[PDB]
């Protein structure tokens, strides 16, 4: 847990998973569903993040949505080949400039940052870091809200 500068406990909630870990995915998958999750989506890598919240924010405006967020919270994993969730982060900032809004981004990791990575959360646009256990997932939220 920390802020980067019960079964319906997110009732009414879209998610997105990233992970490039299939077991990992599988696990926080499941324990958002037992939070009362409306809708999980989970995808492996980066890239994957990056096409479906460029895809879903595109259809939301074109179609003038009430909610213009294709996903209310997204949990990223830190590592990851070829786009690493520091990078795909970047890029679906960059991506949300034109609509005006900013979704929430967790980070994940199953280590304290250092230093270096510390710096990235920041500038990647983080808004929030939690271990892989996702034992503080609530608070998190709660701290987000
Ligand atoms: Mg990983």
Same mark, same amino acid.
Do not use: G, N
């Given at each position: 847990s920390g802020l980067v500068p019960d079964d =319906?406990? @997110?009732?009414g909630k879209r998610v997105l998973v990233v992970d490039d870990n299939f077991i990992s995915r599988k696990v926080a998958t499941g324990k958002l569903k037992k939070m009362g999750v409306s809708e999980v989506e989970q995808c492996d890598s980066g890239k994957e993040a990056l096409r479906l919240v460029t895809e879903g924010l595109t259809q939301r405006e074109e179609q003038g949505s009430?909610?213009? @967020? #294709?996903?209310?919270?997204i949990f990223m994993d830190?590592? $990851? #080949? =070829? $786009?690493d969730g520091y990078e795909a982060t970047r890029e679906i900032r960059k991506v949300e400039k034109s609509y005006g809004v900013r979704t929430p981004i967790i980070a994940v990791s199953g280590h304290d940052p250092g230093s270096e990575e510390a710096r990235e959360t920041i500038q990647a646009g983080m808004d929030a870091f939690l271990d892989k256990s996702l034992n503080q997932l609530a608070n998190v939220i709660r701290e987000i809200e």
């Open positions: =319906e406990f @997110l009732r009430v909610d213009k @967020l #294709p996903f209310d919270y830190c590592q $990851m #080949p =070829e $786009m």
